[PDB]
Design a protein around this ligand. Structure first.
Ligand SMILES: [Cl-]
Ligand SMILES: [Zn+2]
Ligand SMILES: [Zn+2]
Ligand SMILES: [Zn+2]
Ligand SMILES: [Zn+2]
Ligand SMILES: [Zn+2]
Lengths: 49, 396, 397, 396, 396
């Protein structure tokens, strides 16, 4: 839960999961970029954020 | 093992300490340990079972960390924690059961189940913390080749053996001289019987000797000695050595004479007790030598004088008893005893899931066969399963 | 219960850890727990004891908190803490005694004394902390109806019973076939005696059977089985079932034949042991069936042959024994055992203050009466008083 | 004693908790306590041994502190800690042994070895921390003059004594009335025998009494009372009181009548049970009075009537037996029991190093002599050595 | 179970309350609960099982919420609600049927079907609301370790049993003294019969005793006690205990004498009624002891005096009878009774789908065999299935 993560300030679990490439779902109202470029997908930029 | 023990101890501490209303300062270190366990376990897949009727179970960890409060835990916190705790306890029980039902002639001390083998990886060493129980402490010491110690109340050190030796006999079994004994668990009951009451024996003394070779060295042993053997003081009909015939025993009990208990280690006398009854201490031994004597009483009242004629037939056979009871001892190896449940737990788990007989332990985990042939490989496997059984007992 | 246990646990930790010269970092968490206890209890009146000879005691709490500025504990700090601890220990002793001498038919698991009832309120739940003792742990598991477990060395699972059954008998009592048993505590001694030595039996086999029904299920039970029964192996003069006359028993012991131990649960075989002596494991059972045969030995030396004639009179009666000792077991209900003191403590408190007989327990806490009729209401009351007795034993003992 | 215990407890906690991979949060308080122990002990010289064959050993403490900055403990940290732990464990073991082998008459509670007396100095109290064990807790209560309590499973309260008293006797020992008993450990078997089966007794009833005095008061005692004495239910030939002759005993067992067990404190009846067998509770007592009766069966079958004639000779002797087994009790004094090991440890150390007999304890630490003459001075010395033995058992 | 009950209660309320023309305020809370149920169930797949002939069924939830903004419900609203209600009712009925046909020995109180285990997940706890029925209230109280009781009109506490005991008998069966009894359901009919009419009995009184040990404790029991047993008041030809022959019973009914009905708990008398007939109250008991006496009438008119001769042959056999009917009672455990349909519902569902016999219940859910061996595992399974049957009864 992104709201809980913002409130606690404790980023240990999220940091450990991101460092170790552990599949996860971040839940919360998020702004998103609409990318229409195939090259952006081939560059795998959605994984860089 | 240390890691499995640490998981189990963390879960036990969480169950005991994460209680509604408690100060967060009571649980802070425990919460940190628990969250570290969650971090280390999350994302790892485990498989338990697939032996006998133990079902195959798959374990996945995708849990959140336990939160923090200002002052005291509330009911919400406890329920949230208890969900995670319950899943972890299920997992640990299943891992322990998977390890308890497996054995190996080679490397019987090493983990045998897949989940414990995975738990021995470096990544899980973070979980490891206070290893304070007797079994885990001895496990760590034995890994380091340091002197181990297990304290047993009434150790099951003697395999069951109800036998007799005849030193003087003949096909009619009417003038018999010999010894009969029960070695069972932590008790020795021996009795030397002379049918002639040592009428012809030199000095009117018949010497009886019994030797029990303990399969492991006992130390710091409290032993009760009692003059009589209540098990061999009533009349009985006993099979012949080859079973061909039965003979008759009609004990009349006399005080054992020149009682001498020797506790020996590697063939050397360590402790000696002459005509001492009650509590004695055997500090370090692997052999018990009980020497006693039937001394014909030089004076007899007419009732007594009648029972022991100069010659056959002998109807009242003079028996001298001896009872030895190891109340508590210390052994460098693991043993069954009257106060623990490790053997019973392992046997229960093996019987409940119909574990087929393996190449290490006797069928049914029968203690008599196991202790009779207590090989080092058996000792390693049995220490492993006993440690796992204790780890399981922390939670189940 | 959890609050009373937490009070006692805090007091015991304070007695063990608030010691002269110790690093404050050794006791910081304990100091916080002790201060939380003091804060919660301050300003509360309690009354304990208005039953039997237990006196009415009134308890008032107005204590200062222990300091937190020291780096090491000095003598004065320890003495002031000890003063507070002594008052609290006296109070907890009295609350435990007051709860132990009371029973209820309806909610025997619930508190009965007024002080523990007050301690059940929400304001006191702050005191609650580490519940690690086996009895309080089982208590919390039982509250949530999770699988409990009590480990008993030599459980007192058998009520005392010394009796005999006669299958063949007649008024002279000289050709008797039957069984005699002592079931006491954790031990079953049984013996089948045939006076004719199965001379006229069908193939010279006399089958004996003994059924013991436990009032609670036992799990993970280590049991010693020894072939002989020393209790029924010497001459005896025994009353008749009606008590009119007395008969004679002159036994001669033969090894029992085809010994079969059966451990059963709900009338279903769980463990079977055949010709196995020494240590055995009964994993889960509520009934023991011991079946064993007297086999007339086909070949006898002249003394043995003289013992057992072809017909009456029979002077030497063929007896086969069995001894069964539960060394350790696990039960989901509380039980008296050889190592603990819960029953003895409850009985001692009840006798010390002349607690009148109540509607739950036997006329004086006799364990035979209790275990014979171990009903659920009795189980609830007994678990309550035993948990209280353990809490008291943490401090008083 | 509290300082020695705290040293041992710190060392045991360090052994169990300073392990590879553990969070520093798990050990931070322990690390502070350990460093405080190093600081307090540094620059201090000790000498142990010099009694019997216990070798003189010199101890010097100049150690570095453990680090505090790690997030998780690594192998280097554990080895660094383990070197110091090994030296300290050796020192504590030697101090415990040096104290266990010494005794004093006037002030036997106080420390006897020079090292422990030095450790009783004020400056060493900084080491002192959690005193949670039963023996150290009772030690601190006794030092504060509070009520003490030791739980014993099968307390060894009764010194070994197998004796008989004849209330009716003749030189031919054929019409004998009396009783025989074994008191041993936590067991009391008694048996009253009438050779005439109370034919000439006023109401055909023979009353038997047995008083046993416990050398210490027992409280909260769970006892099992059984109506037969297997120890005195088989035929035996028994010496005479002077030892000049031997008499014959041919028991036939009748159930005891009007069984009355009284548990007394200072001659006052605390507990009383009539015709009650199985488990009974003696709440507080120092004496056990067993009264039972042989009641001649008014109606007999022909075999029973043949056993007991009107006049002599008497070949079948009527016997009624009682068995009293203390399974658990509480005593304000230290006692040997079946589950603990303090007595065995003290005796083992006194034997391995050939400690000369001192002016307090009987030779060889024999328990029967100690408990028969359990004087206050002996109790003080025994509590000291038992506390030391427990502290030693924490590490060795 | 609480969630399944909440689903059923929501559906029952929706059926009863969502009706044309009704004010929305009458149903507003119910509509909120219904929408909460829809939200919690949406997006979840369920499978109700294929055990026996019960077909495998798959359930999907993608329902919209019911409106909230009308002043009065209209026909469109009712039709829209009914569409969703029908599906939810079908799903709940299938879950109840799947749970009713399953049993477990280790944990019979826990849910057995996959759907009910899924519904016990925390994600469904939002559905839970008013638990007001007796069975669900008992369920919650029992999960809370709280004293709760089921009220039974004519509880079926007695296993069916029609038997007799002959205390005096002979191969010709013509001078018989004994008892005949039927224990059936909530009814006991007992009768003591003496053929000699106590002509040769001490004081001319024959005593009869009948003990019925209830398998569960009953409380606040209203009982009718009538002084005769019409079941054993007419001529009968009765098999013998082995069935080898048939004997003849020719009752003549006399008033039972010294009628004493005891209701006992743990062997102690709780209630006692002497010569009282009509309504009595047994407040708390597990056993019923009926003592009664056939008293020979001291004076007899010639017609009466003929029926009872001084010796055989005896043609008119004097019988005294009692009848005990439990009208109402309370039990901790669940029981069949004359009013409730839980047993009938469970048995019907098990019969319709050819559910094999499991390891818990007897074949066919036969109540006599079930109540005879009412084990704790049977009790747990039976309370579970009875609660599920009541929940199903709310809708089906
Ligand atoms: Cl024991
Ligand atoms: Zn032979
Ligand atoms: Zn024991
Ligand atoms: Zn008889
Ligand atoms: Zn004499
Ligand atoms: Zn018949």
């Amino acid at each position: 839960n992104l709201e809980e993560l913002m409130r606690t300030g404790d980023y240990a679990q999220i940091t450990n999961m991101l460092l170790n490439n552990q599949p996860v779902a971040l839940v919360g109202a998020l702004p998103f970029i609409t990318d229409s470029s195939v090259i952006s997908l081939v560059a795998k930029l959605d994984a860089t954020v | 093992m240390d890691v499995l023990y640490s998981l189990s101890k963390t879960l036990k501490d969480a169950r005991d300490k994460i209680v509604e209303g408690t100060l967060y300062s009571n649980v802070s270190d425990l919460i940190q340990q628990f969250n570290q366990m969650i971090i280390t376990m999350n994302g790892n897949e485990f498989q338990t079972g697939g032996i006998g009727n133990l079902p195959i179970r798959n374990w996945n960890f995708d849990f959140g960390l336990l939160g923090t409060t200002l002052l005291n835990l509330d009911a919400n916190y406890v329920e949230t924690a208890r969900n995670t705790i319950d899943y972890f306890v299920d997992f640990v029980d299943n891992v322990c059961m998977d390890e308890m039902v497996r054995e190996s002639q080679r490397n019987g001390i090493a983990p045998q189940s897949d989940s414990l083998r995975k738990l021995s990886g470096i990544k899980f060493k973070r979980i490891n913390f206070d290893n304070s129980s007797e079994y885990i402490e001895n496990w760590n010491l034995q890994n380091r080749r340091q002197r181990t110690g297990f304290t047993f109340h009434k150790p099951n050190i003697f395999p069951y053996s109800a036998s007799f030796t005849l030193n003087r006999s003949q096909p009619a079994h009417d003038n018999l001289m010999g010894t009969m004994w029960l070695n069972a668990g932590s008790e020795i009951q021996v009795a030397g019987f002379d049918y002639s009451c040592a009428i012809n024996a030199p000095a009117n003394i018949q010497q009886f000797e019994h030797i029990v070779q303990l399969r492991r060295v006992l130390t710091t042993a409290t032993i009760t000695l009692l003059p009589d053997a209540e098990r061999f003081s009533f009349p009985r009909v006993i099979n012949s050595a080859d079973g061909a015939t039965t003979w008759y025993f009609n004990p009349v009990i006399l005080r054992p004479n020149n009682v001498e208990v020797e506790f020996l280690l590697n063939g050397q006398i360590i402790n000696t007790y002459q005509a001492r009854f009650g509590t004695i201490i055997a500090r370090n031994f692997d052999t018990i030598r009980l020497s006693f004597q039937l001394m014909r009483p030089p004076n007899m009242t007419p009732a007594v004088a009648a029972l022991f004629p100069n010659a056959q037939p002998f109807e009242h056979h003079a028996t001298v008893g001896l009872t030895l009871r190891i109340e508590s001892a210390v052994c460098e190896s693991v043993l069954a005893d009257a106060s623990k449940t490790m053997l019973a737990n392992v046997t229960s788990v093996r019987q409940e899931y119909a574990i087929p007989v393996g190449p290490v332990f006797p069928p049914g985990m029968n203690w008599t066969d196991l202790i009779t042939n207590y090989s080092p490989s058996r000792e390693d496997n049995l220490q492993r399963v006993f440690t796992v059984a204790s780890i399981r007992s922390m939670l189940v």
